[PDB]
Symmetry: D2
Subunit: 397 residues, 4 copies
């Protein structure tokens, strides 16, 4: 199998990398097989993962070895998730990580401020269409100096000592990077409202200055958000907690504004999904029915508003449900049910057996940490989709 | 001597780093001695240089070995300069380089777009006061993607295939980084006027949005520049060719707008120095007299660098850079002696020549015309007059 | 194709590595395909080649860039050859290289004394059955200190400033390393006879002390060689110029003693092949007829005497014919003829078309440097075989 | 101070290297000062240490972070010691380490078989007189393949999962490497007597084949050892546990055979020191009196190290190593003062305690029992008496 062949051919520079491979790569290869990637792409993505991602992952937290940097991306503190994005017809695999610098979580780098960009630089000489300009824009607007990073660490739990996260879509035959910047450290240290910071960073983008439609969409979103998030500097959910961009040509990149909140019920889902009554069309409502059904059939909730240059009008957000603490066999049975409801019979009929085969070392009827998040979306052009995020290390140990 | 001891202690990871050391470090150690740095700071800076700068300099261009990336920073194509900044009371040493990535000047990195930031990241875990926000801001506004970088290379000579360069001030026992971003590649690829792209990038700075005084100073500079630099997309002089920032807290960083031009005479000097009559105070006029005198005493373009600080509403006189490539270095030394006497810096005058010879022991500097590359002169209200002398260190050694 | 997929997935740390890949890896992948390696082994070997060999190859000599170290392994000074070993039924691909240290050919490393062992160390943590003890034994007996290496360089042409060479057999599904140590630098600097040095280094092996049969074989070989190679310190071919070992368990390793000479004619072939009349059996003679025929149908000639612990009796050597300067289309037509004579009809019928497909950038009817060496062997148990060494860079530029 | 300046100039590639520096370099700089190394040599050695030794030390074992490889070189499992060698006229500093590979103590490298050679290769391009031939010889004779290394790990406690270690003498402004190869893993895996495997490896040396005098000295040592060490395959004392060489021209290298044993009293000391009566000369007897006196003034095994040089036919007295782990370090300091007075080294006696406290400022050395780990004593016909004091530097700092 590719993951075994690459281990034979490449070995490992060090033991943490070897332990990362032994705890993730068989799962990754399985996901790729299940999603119908050809063998040549399996090799491509696994070889890429070996060379670029393994060294980015830092030490492998395990009994007796407590790293200096502890990630919020997973239950055991490992800076890695693997996700799938499921349509009617097809499934795409994606990696989410934090790239860990070698002084991360110590005085010289308290918020792991440098590793992700270093990874992106290696990707920019690897891949012709990687563009770092929006990364650099937002790193400039929300990043902090060393002293400020140290102040932020005294105000934040260990699992939130970060400023950026990276995801890599393994799509078509390419690697497509996207990043998310956190607003909280800058809000805490500057005592500036999260809302003001978020929109000020956005309004200073080059593309915002050139694109009237984006400015119109952003003004509707600010109207919607202003009354719903804090006006003061407090970290009171609901709040504008992340800004996401795609590492592509800025005029093509989707700009994402992510809300985090700890309350969700039907009223709130409806409010978020329709932007308080702004969106009342049939596509929107069909999406809403999906999301309501999913909630009935079934960490903060997330709401992600995505905007593109050239589009004046806002769409429904993607909504993220946290699943940590809920039985993974229950979740699987629920998703089978939801897939049937969506008419995705094939996905329903394979979901549970494929889930087990992804995570052979664990008994999913006994685990509660393997499914970590579920995202749901509905797009006027693309259709409905569902994003499932897995704590791959929890699924392997 | 420190440069020799460090060569013995540390060796070299490869032969290009060894050649960079054998052509630069003895000079650098000399400069630091001549500037009255203590032995401990000589070690600090030479060890820093070995660890951080040698790998950043890439291959050492030499007969039989042509790198893929050729720098415009020096005559022989070497991405390094060493400068001194001279006052009444003190002299400080500065390094200027381009950090060369390992695929620089090839399809995967046509304009060497990544090495300087990588160096800066390493400096940010080394030094507590290094700040990358303004670097990242301007890299975002004036940097180009790979395909654009490839287009730019078809429109620029090999020595101008760059977007950024870095200087490191070796001051107060610290290393203070500053960078300069080139506007030309973006201007060429986007067919936008240099003046428009320069000020649009500046106007999107976070600090510009928060600081009324900086906006006001910028606004006076634009009024001065707009009728003097092109309004079209042409690359013709005087032009806004570089944006400089200091890699420190954005609220403390000096923002620089550098003009390049070929034409200079006393009336242009006055125009640049006084911003066409805007500045008429005694300090300004005393400065002007100094700069005129230097010009009389004395091909690359002239430079004119307008430096602005958040919290300051008013423009000061720029620093003026005289290009010295092609002029005999013994003449330049005699000219500087003369100028130092005129400023009343007798001690600097009496040591300049002997010190120059001792900086460059492997070459006869009276026979060279490329060792002195630039001379910058400045006057400050609070700080006094200063002179910046930029040396092509490799031309001084090979 | 694997070589293209790996280039997409891995990129290159630097431009010399990229140029090595662009001048060799398509050829390598072609060789592996032609030899019926499965796709999974093609990936294994090409990924291995990317990770381990590319950085070992040093700079890529090209117009305007003259490295400090110039290899004798190829016509353009590149430290690389690809060879095939052909039987009746099957063909095996092998890599020959010098691993170039980053100070090679300069005062701090005048004879490139360190790179090969550094490569072997990385292989010893990659591959479970790699054994370095014989490497270290011979490096101890024939290696030189810095001053001695500098003296040797004043007495040797630039293309012979080396002490070790490495080959990697890509066999079964493994990588099997072998090395060759040169005796000449130590002979020159110490003014010791090459014969004395060679046998003294051998007689100090641990396995020689434990294995009576090897000592008996070695005593017959010394009897045969003593009158034929110099008794003085001169570098007068015929001479004992290399010692070869396999980097495996010393009790399994073949020990090789390689003679170089500039004269070969029928008398001498017969003398070398039969060890001056010692070997007169039917297998030996059948081998001799092969070798004579090959010579008629068609750098020093080489003669390689291989011995194994547990075997008291010497076998016929492998004989190496240099082909540099001879037309590569002529060579191909000759080999087709020789293959037919051996009854290897299938090999004959595909040789020329496969050769062209290995080296598509060149016209083999116009080149004289692509075939560099040919080795012929006959083994009592294994049968006849032929080793063809290609200047892969000459075949690509 | 140099250790601080280098930390400022160089920083650290990772947090384990930073912790190694923060627990060792201040001590090391102190030792070098105390030994009257000039500031330039202090820089030379501390910069060398930063570049070459810090990466070789692997992870810094500490609460919450357990490495895969645990060294027997120190009490806390840290692969580092610092020693001083004291004469009448001078004191020199030595580093002892294991160079830890990145897969050490795991399936791909169970006995850390590659790191020390890799360090030595880097030293061989750094320093002109470093020679790897004897290293490679003994690595060939006593080193093991992966499967054998895995077998050995099942028969040895974690702290003895090693085959080699390295010392670096910081002498004459140079770095002089030496190594010690363990015989036990080969003895265990092959079930061969340690005595037989030790001498078979020695007897295959190129220099042994060329040097009649060394063979003769070896022959006298074997006669002495054969009735004292086991004839069977057992790992019981006194045993031939290490072979030491200097990484120099084989014809100049001292070959060492190190015995380990637990039992010592005055009659055993005499036996080891005189080789059971073989040596009876005045120098030898004067040495013996010294060593007896030290023993009276004063768990790891005792060591006895027999050092032989090509061209010398006759055996000299060994160096004897007293194990000091578990004994109070204030007592040891008082004992050494007493011994120094007895040797007539008044100045060394008068400074020993104060200097010890200044070497280890972060710990109260009067409360510790692991900081002094070994004390070696030697007498040489030509050179005089000497004392080697080995410190667990990390135990002196944490
Ligand atoms: C770890 C935190 C803060 C939230 C977990 C959920 C998460 C990382 C959503 C990322 S948005 P994304 O995966 O990029 O959604 P798509 O546009 O790729 O479909
Ligand atoms: C314009 C071209 C071709 C190269 C750049 C010229 C150059 C080295 C400008 C340096 S300005 P700088 O050294 O930063 O002067 P200060 O403001 O530090 O006094
Ligand atoms: C470059 C020089 C000195 C000779 C060229 C021929 C050469 C390298 C023969 C190697 S012997 P080898 O390839 O290992 O023969 P096999 O036992 O592998 O069949
Ligand atoms: C025997 C065990 C458990 C560890 C080795 C003990 C050790 C550090 C011996 C060093 S002998 P050494 O420092 O080389 O003495 P010198 O001959 O240099 O005077």
């Amino acid at each position: 199998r590719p993951w075994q062949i690459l281990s034979q051919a490449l070995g490992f520079p060090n033991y943490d990398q070897e332990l990362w491979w032994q705890n993730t790569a068989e799962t990754l290869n399985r996901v790729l097989e299940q999603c119908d990637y050809s063998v040549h792409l399996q090799y491509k993505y696994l070889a890429f993962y070996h060379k670029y991602i393994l060294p980015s992952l830092g030490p492998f937290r395990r009994p007796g070895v407590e790293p200096e940097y502890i990630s919020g991306l997973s239950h055991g503190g490992h800076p890695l998730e693997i996700s799938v994005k499921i349509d009617k017809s097809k499934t795409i695999c994606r990696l989410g990580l934090q790239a860990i610098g070698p002084l991360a979580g110590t005085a010289r780098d308290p918020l792991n401020s440098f590793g992700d960009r270093e990874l992106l630089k290696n990707l920019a000489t690897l891949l012709p269409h990687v563009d770092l300009r929006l990364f650099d824009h937002f790193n400039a607007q929300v990043g902090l100096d060393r002293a400020q990073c140290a102040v932020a660490t005294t105000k934040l739990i260990k699992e939130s000592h970060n400023i950026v996260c990276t995801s890599l879509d393994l799509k078509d035959g390419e690697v497509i990077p996207k990043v998310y910047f956190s607003t909280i450290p800058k809000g805490l240290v500057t005592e500036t409202p999260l809302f003001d910071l978020t929109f000020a960073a956005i309004e200073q983008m080059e593309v915002y200055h050139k694109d009237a439609p984006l400015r119109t969409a952003l003004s509707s979103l600010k109207d919607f958000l202003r009354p719903r998030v804090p006006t003061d500097a407090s970290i009171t959910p609901p709040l504008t907690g992340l800004i996401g961009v795609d590492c592509i040509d800025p005029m093509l990149s989707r700009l994402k504004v992510y809300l985090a909140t700890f309350r969700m019920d039907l009223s709130l889902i409806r409010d978020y999904w329709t932007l308080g009554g702004l969106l009342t069309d049939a596509g929107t409502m069909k999406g809403l029915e999906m999301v309501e059904t999913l909630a009935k059939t079934l960490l903060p909730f997330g709401i992600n508003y995505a905007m593109k240059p050239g589009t004046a009008e806002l769409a429904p957000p993607q909504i993220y449900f946290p699943l940590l603490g809920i039985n993974d066999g229950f979740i699987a049975d629920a998703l089978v049910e939801f897939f049937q409801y969506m008419g995705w019979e094939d996905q329903a009929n394979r979901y549970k057996d494929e889930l087990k085969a992804k995570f052979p070392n664990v008994d999913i009827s006994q685990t509660k940490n393997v499914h970590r998040w579920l995202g749901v979306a509905y797009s006027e052009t693309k259709g409905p989709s569902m994003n499932i995020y897995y704590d791959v290390v929890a699924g392997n140990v």
